[PDB]
Every structure is written in C-alpha cells, then in structure tokens.
A paper describes a structure:
ATAD2 (also termed ANCCA) is a histone chaperone that has been implicated in nucleosome density regulation by histone H3–H4 loading or removal. Although histone chaperones responsible for nucleosome assembly and disassembly usually do not contain [name] domains, ATAD2 is unique because it is the only known [name]+ [name] histone chaperone. Here, we demonstrate ATP-dependent histone H3–H4 deposition onto DNA by [name], the fission yeast ortholog of ATAD2, using an in vitro single-molecule imaging technique, the DNA curtain. We solve the cryo-EM structures of [name] in three different nucleotide states (apo, ADP, and ATP), revealing a major reorganization of the [name]+ domains from an open spiral to a closed ring—a structural change that can also be recapitulated in real time by high-speed atomic force microscopy (HS-AFM).
To dissect nucleotide-dependent structural changes of [name], we next determined the cryo-EM structure of [name] in the ADP state to 4.4 Å resolution. We then performed flexible fitting of the ATP-model into the ADP- and apo- cryo-EM maps with MDFF16. Comparison of the ATP-[name] Walker B mutant structure with the ADP- and apo-states revealed striking differences in the subunit arrangement, heights and individual subunit conformation, while the structures of the ADP- and apo-states were similar to each other. In the ADP state, the subunits assumed similar heights forming a symmetric planar ring, whereas in the ATP-state, the subunits were staggered in height and shifted towards the center forming an asymmetric spiral with a smaller pore. The most prominent structural change could be observed at the interface of subunits A and F where in the ADP state, these two subunits maintained similar heights with close inter-subunit packing, while in the ATP state, the subunits were staggered in height and separated by ~40 Å. Individual subunits in the ADP state did not show any significant differences in their structures, supporting the idea that ADP-[name] is largely symmetric. When comparing the two extreme conformations of subunits (subunit A and subunit F) in the ATP-bound structure with the conformation of the subunit in the ADP-bound structure, we found that the bottom-most subunit in the ATP-bound structure (subunit A) superimposed well with the subunit in the ADP-bound structure, while the top-most subunit (subunit F) diverged significantly from the ADP-conformation. Lastly, but more interestingly, in contrast to the ATP-[name] structure, the bromodomain density was stronger and more symmetric in the ADP- and apo- structures. When ATP hydrolysis occurs, [name] transitions to a planar ring with a larger pore, potentially allowing for remodeling and/or release of histone H3–H4.
Residue numbers in the entry:
A (entry chain F), B (entry chain A): 256 to 773, 1128 to 1186
The structure:
Amino acid sequence: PLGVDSSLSFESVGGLDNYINQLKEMVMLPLLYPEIFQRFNMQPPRGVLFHGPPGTGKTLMARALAAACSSENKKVSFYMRKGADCLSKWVGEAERQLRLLFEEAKSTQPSIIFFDEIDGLAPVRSSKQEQIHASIVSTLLALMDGMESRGQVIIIGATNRPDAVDPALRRPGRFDREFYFPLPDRDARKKIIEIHTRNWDPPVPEWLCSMLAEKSKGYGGADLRALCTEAALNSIKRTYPQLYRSTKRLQIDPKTIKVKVKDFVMSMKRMIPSSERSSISPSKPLSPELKPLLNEAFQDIEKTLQKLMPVASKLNPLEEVMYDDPKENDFEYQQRLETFETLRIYKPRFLICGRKGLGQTALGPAILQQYEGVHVQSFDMSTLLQDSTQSIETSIIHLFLEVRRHTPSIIYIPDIDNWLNVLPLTAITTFSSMLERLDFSDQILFLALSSSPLSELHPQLREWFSSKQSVYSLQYPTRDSIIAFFQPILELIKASPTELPGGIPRKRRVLPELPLAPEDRLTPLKQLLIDSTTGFTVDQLLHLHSFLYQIIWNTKSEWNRNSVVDECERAVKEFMI
Amino acid sequence: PLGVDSSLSFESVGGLDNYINQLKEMVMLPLLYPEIFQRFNMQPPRGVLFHGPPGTGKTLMARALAAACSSENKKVSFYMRKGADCLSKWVGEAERQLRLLFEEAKSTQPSIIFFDEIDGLAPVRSSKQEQIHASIVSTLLALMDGMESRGQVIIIGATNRPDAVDPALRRPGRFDREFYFPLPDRDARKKIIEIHTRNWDPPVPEWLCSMLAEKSKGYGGADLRALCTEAALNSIKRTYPQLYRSTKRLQIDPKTIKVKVKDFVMSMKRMIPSSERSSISPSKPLSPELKPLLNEAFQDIEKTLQKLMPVASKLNPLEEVMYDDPKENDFEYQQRLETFETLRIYKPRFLICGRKGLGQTALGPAILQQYEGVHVQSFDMSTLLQDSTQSIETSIIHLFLEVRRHTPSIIYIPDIDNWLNVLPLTAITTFSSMLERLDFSDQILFLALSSSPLSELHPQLREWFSSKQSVYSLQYPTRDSIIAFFQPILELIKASPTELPGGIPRKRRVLPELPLAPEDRLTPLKQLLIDSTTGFTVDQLLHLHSFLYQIIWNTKSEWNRNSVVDECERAVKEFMI
C-alpha cells in the first residue's frame, strides 16, 4: 500500500540551491562555529517566511528542512505545527497550550519548529473584534522574541502570501529571511522530474526530458509524482486488462514492467494543472504548423526583444566568490559594475499593430512562452472588473504596488483597440499617471496588443509611444510560407488507407488468466489553392483547414488513387463566396 | 549565538536630547527633590505617549527608558506590558488580572510600567459592540487615575499613531507628554551609526560616515544593526569560502577580521528600507553626472528657496537658558522676538514651468533631498484615490487637517498639467477653499510642478500665483554643460582593456582547509555630437547615453586604438531620424 518517508535528499524540491546556502548560513553556523559570535559579538537571528505556490516547496521544503537538518547533524529534534492546533476560545487556555509547547520546545535543546498557516496562527490585529485577536498575537510576540531570548531554537514560518498579515509579525531583526518560491520552469523542472523518474528500476529515456518537462508547466513536487502514478497505472491497465471483478482473489507475476510514452500522453489528456485549477493564463506555445506562418517575424520579436531589453539574470554568489579579484577597496570600481548592465536601459515597452484575423493574440502567449523565469502579469479587464468591493482604481494602485514589489517584471495589455472604451477617464488618467510614477532606470516590460493596423490610431498611444522602434506593423505572409503550411496535408491526400487509420483494422485483445489466490490534377488543385486565394487572412485559412480535414475524414478510406479531388475543390469553390 | 542586553547608554536611539531632558524633568524630580512639591503644592503628572515610526525609538526608547532609570538610581523596578496580555472575554476576569497587576505595581514602590499597543489595550469606546469595549476602557480610566491617586508609579504609553483612539484616553492632566519620533536624517544618523560601529575592535573609517549615513535613509536602530550584521557576514563569506557542507565539524582561527566598503555597498544592493516596505516616496538625489546639467539652476532653487522661506529651526532651551539676559520683565521685549523670524513671511508656494523631457520630475525629489528635517507630504492623486470607503473630499479635509496638525510643513503637487483634469470641480473648489482656510502667517510650502512651459496656461494657477517670483521658467542647457556631461565617456572611449573589465581576467580562488573539529577623428566625432545636435532634450540625451553604453559594452575589448569610432557615429546617424 502507501507510506510516507522521513528521509529527503532534496529529491522532490531540488533546485533551490541559493536558498539552501542561505538557510545553511542561518541554521548550521550558530553551533558549528560557536566562537565567532563573540569575536564579533553578533546576533544574527533565525526565521524564514515562505510564500509562493503551496506544495511547490511548502510541504516539500518542510521535508527538505527537517530532512536537511536531520541529515546534517546528530542529534536534533523537529516539531510540526500547522496553523491553529493548540487553541481555545479562552485566552489563557489557548495560550497555556502554546507556551507549555514553548517551554517544552525550550527544554529539548536541539529543536526547530515548523509553523504553517500563519494567518490561522495569528491574523491581523484589529480591535473591532474580540480581544483574543490582540491577545494571542501580542503573546506570540513576547513568547517568540522581544522578552524571550530563545537561545538555540529555530522558528520556521510559511504562507502562500508574503503580506497576508500586518508587518508587526515581521519584526525586522527576528524574521529577516523570506523565501519566494518561483515554480521552476524548464531546467530545474527537468532536474526535478528526472530526480523523480530514477526511482524506478526501468530508467526513463532522456529525449522525453525536457520534452515532458517543457510540457508540464505549473506543477509541484507532489502532482508531478501524481503524473508518475497516473502514467504508472496507465502502464498497469495497459499491460493487463484482467484487473476487474475479483471475489476469488488473484495472484500476479512480478515481471509487470513495461513503460510507454503513450502512458504519459494519455496522462496529458487526463491531467489538470494546479495553477489552472482556478486561473486562466495565456501560457500557450505557438502552433507547430503555424511556425511556417509566424517564425519569420517571431525571430524579429525575440531578437528585438533581446536588444530592447537584456533578459540577463543573477549568477550564484557561490561561484562568484569562488572567483576572486585582486582589488577590494574600490567603491568606484563597485559603482562601475553597478552602472554596468543597469544604466543601459530606458523604459521597456512594445506595441503590436496589425490587421484582424492575421496572427493576433496567439503570438502573445507564444512570446510569453519563448522565455520564462521572469515575473509577469497582465492588466486583463476581466481581472480588473473581477472585484467590486473596492474601487477599480484602488485595484489599479494595488496591482501597480505589487508589480512594484517584485523583480524586474512584465506588464501586458491585450486588445487596446477595444480597450480605452471599457473604463472611464478616471482609470485612464490613473493609468497614465502610474506609467510615469516609476523611473526609467528599472526594467519593467510593457507589451501592448492591438487588432487594428497602423496609421489610423487615436494618438493616446502615440504620445505614449513616440519611439520609432516601440511598435511593429504586420503584413500578409508569403506564398512560399503558404504552400509550406499546406504542404503536409497536400501529401496527406496521398497517404490514406494504412498510414492513417482510414482503413486500418483495430483488433481485439485476449484476456490473461492471472491465477486464483485464495497526382496530375494536384497542380490544377495547386492553382486552385494558390493564386485564386489572393493572400487572405489566416483565420480563413483555418476555416479551409478545418473544412479539408472534414473532407479527408469523410473520404478516409480509398484505394486506386486520383478519385478524391472533387470534394475539396468544390469546397474551395463554395468557400469563395 | 545571540543574546539581548539590559544596559543601554542611549547607543541605538541616541540623539533625542531635548526628549531626554523632558522626560528627566518628569521622572527624576518627584523623589530627587521632594520639598518643592509643597513649597508650591504642585501636581505635575507623568505619562508620555509615543507615536511615529515603530522601532525608531519604540522598543529603542523602551530600552532607553528602563536603562535610563536603571542607570539613574538604585533601587527601581520596571514592568513591560505589550498590548492585550492580561485579558479575557469576561469583564471581571480580564480586569481582575489587570488590577491585580495594578495592586502589585502599587506594592512595589519604585516602579514604572511600559504600555505598548494602546489600541489593543483600549480601543475607541463604542456601544455598537459588546460592552467590554466600554468596560475595560472606563475601568482603565478609574484605575490609572481619576479615582486613584497613583502616588509614585509611572505609566508609559506608546503607539504608531497619536490619534488611533478617542481623546478621552488623553485626559489633559495625566498624560500631558507625547513624543513624536522624527526619524533622524543626516547628522544624528551619523551619530547613531558611529555609536553602533564602535562596537567592533576594528574602528571604521570616517570618510564613509556620513557617506553611508546619507545613503541610509528611513531606518531604525535595529535595521541599521541589520546593516551591520549583513556587512559583517559579507566580510565572513568574503574572507572565507569554506563555510559549507560540514558534518565533520570544523574549527577556525580567531584572526578573521577584515572589513570592506565593498561589504557595505553589496549590502546596499541587498537591502530593503523600512519605510519603503509599502510606501513609494520620492527621496531621490539628483544624478551626479546630471549635476552638470542642473546645478546651475538648482543653486537658484535652493537660494530662492532660502530667501522665500527661511528654514531656521528651534535651538535647544538648555543652551538658550545657559545663556542669560538681564531684562526679564518685558513682555514687549518678548513680543519683539515673537515678531522676529515669524512675521517675516507670506504664504510659501513655488511653481515650476518648463518643457517636457527637460529635467522634469527629478529635480523635485532632488530638492526634497537637498534639505530634510521638515515634515512633508504631497497630494499625489494615487494617494488620493487609494481609498473609496469615504469621499475623496473627506480625504482632502482629513489630510489638510493632519498637515494642519504638524510643524511648519511641506505640500507638493506633481504634474498639474495632467492634474485638474483628474478630479471634478467638487475637489477643485474644495482645494481652492482649503488654500485660503489658513493664514499667511504660518509656514507651509506649496511646491508645484508642471511639464508644460510658460505663457500658455489656464489661469487658475495665475490667479493663485500672481506673484512674479512665484514661478520659474526653464531653458535648454548650454553647450559647455553638454560637453561637460559627455566628457567622461569621451575619455571612456580611450580606456577600455584594463581600466574597465573589457579585457581584465577574472581568476579563481583556492579553498582553505579549516581543520577538522570532532584621437584625430575624435574632433569630427565632436562635431557630430555637438552642433548637429541642436540643443535637444535631456531624455534624448539619455537615449544616446544608453545607446553608446551598449556600443562600448559590445566593443569592450580593443587594443591598437582608433578602430572603434564607426559604431557610435552611425548610431548617431540613425538617431537623427
């Protein structure tokens, strides 16, 4: 059956190395080196506040910390407190459980305590309720620190939000660490999936990683293990159909090890993402047959993206200090590199103008997918009108405040032709103010999408975007790209009966026992598809593509060729209306 | 490891001298001199209410008061009460803890009690809740004073806000002291940082103070100590890389004392301000290479600032009464100096008109930084639309009321060209009324910024600001200031390979053991940069400055000179479109 483990070698949360060194410098040093705390007479406190996606290192870095320190040294004890679990309606009974737990935590000397659900442990301190909201918060203040020199004990905090509570709970000088979980995307995703998949006596192929790791976006350690279990059970029922209706119990052979990539892709048909349980995010790669239709400008988007903003990230200070320099006295040499790759910028924004039905609003999610690791959100007016409890301008100042409270991050607005007709001049001039409230010298991108083409626009954008390179206009694709797009189906006309299942028999499987345990017109069709379709829009090409898919689906079984051209050609004739 | 101290000689809150003498006159005299309280038969009560930034003398003046009186005389006892810590849902049980604490506080004769979180101790007294909100407030009234001659005991209050509660809690005659904490800016900042840094056996240099003290703005005693610890640990990992992965424990040498200014500036890269945890304040000094482009008028701003308002502050009455005068009977001589430096004023305001892209909205934060110690806020419509629970005009009358409840203080509005299109005539005529609701004879500054130049304006400002010196117009800078600005990079063309890291090798550091414990075209380029750039705007100069930074970044490694002029010159040619 099932079972939980108490040993973790960072094998389901693995990849947060700089976090690991940051916590190692907090928890290892005070009793590893007990001398330099008097050589300098130094304090440094301990305590980390987790925030980010839950289960992406919430329970997983809980096991990574208890397993980390248990694998670190002997002896050491560990404590798990998950929200309100020692409380009452009394103050003086709730708390007497709490500080009996505190005094026994102080009695056991090598000891850490996990505290999760810090909102449930201590909410915001308001006096418009009963005074236990002030009482347990103040008594946790004095009983964690302030009055209480805790000595050798370590207090761990975890939330989903870094600001779900009043900042008195983060007194600066006791809880000076806060860890954000960035949900690793591609490479530590491939690391975390391959450190999972080696727990099987069949080693997995490594062409499927980072193939499956780039398919899997928005997942924790546990649900990627759920992908492991669902592909596993797909191998189970796949290998054996006789898994049903057993009152007389059965026995098995132990040689039931067969693995498919079909198991994984059926798991992808049968999955659901964790972030996409309640969200809608445009995390959509560009369509692979549409790459003949948009790679040619997509390259210009990613190159001019790279030029108008470097996407350069921070290296590890471990290897940086593994390097050494000779000169260390020169703050002028410091302000040199502090000017380097920092003062090279000015106000990241970009605009897309082009016709409707011409590759719109898919390239947006595509260039969202062409690089990751950055923080990003968009001013979707669905996400702006989603609350009415406050003003929408209060929501504007809020969301501008949180994208201010990040890394160099990404801001997007779709459909600005329809937008600015949606909200009044309150929110308009609000936003135009908030455009200028921040500096040029920070790196926040401002992607902008319009479904209307150029030189016809209200000038609100124009005074905002008077740079000649702050915009790009779109054109029709070339005929060679067109015939590149219709190429594969133009040989799928010829490969019906046994290449495709239009004429492939599907046969039955027998049950196991599992014993008892007690050609020539192709070119006039070519001049029908080309040169009579005078460079139209790509959605119309999607119409035709769907239509011919219906044609070849209905005409899926045919031998003795050149008999199935009449259906598609008259469909083109009808399409020209 | 860590540890708290019980002795403070005003070494982390040091600088509030007049506050210290004010509290000394409250707490020392009643038992120092027990005779003059019958010579005059005088009351004077005791009790101070702290308000201001927390941890900037909240916990720090708590330790300064208990350490102050403990270092004052023997014997004396101290009590610490932090919000709701003796309460219940009963009235009669909550209170019986409270006045058992009161009677034991009266039993111990030399005794003071710290009371913090006065909102959590006693909220506003409303009868639209349960009556314990009236009960504990009324019983704290009668049990602190009113009915109870407290005798010899001292009651200390502390909040963040001076008006977080109904003013019945400040009965005039028991709590007649209230201390505001002004967050000392430059000189007591240098005093407070140097009284920290002498706690190390390496004495720090004193060119870095007040250099680092003028870099550090918006910090308490504790987080400046956190700057001490982070520069300390930066020296730790900086001196020693072998601080990792030790199950077999290690031992050290005690000679690990090396200090860098690099440690501090990396701490500045890795810091976060306390006031800037949720705020956005334009506390921004002018850019040092932009000083050739705005010092010439900046001097006029600070001089005419000084003339249109003296910034003269109050001296200490200690040294003032250390001086003596012969004549003390003359209230007419009193109203002389009461007319001196008080009646010399009229209605402080100032206006900035000038073109867009021409030094705007950076000089504002700069002259905010050119002097400090004054109280200041601005009517940012982000900060005006940030709440919708009340009317925005209610917010107007509120904020006018609190800037009325201050020192001679500072009021600013940015972007008045875009403003007055943001709010209706309700808030407009509201504000114009509140312009005239106060007198000429008080000293409140009214800085005003417009991005549009002169002689083109709607006259609402003109009837408000019909003084010929109430406004200043802006011009283009001179060519000598231009070539002064482009001067340093115009020698950074010549100093690539070893002055800059474009051709400097970065080498590796070995691990310690730490043993086991069980030229000629420069002038045509000069006539390309000057005299073909016909006195343009400074943001365009920022474009070019960024562009050439990219040029020299890409061309960073070059010997055998005069080969790298072609890239920048064609960048200028492309820029001229």
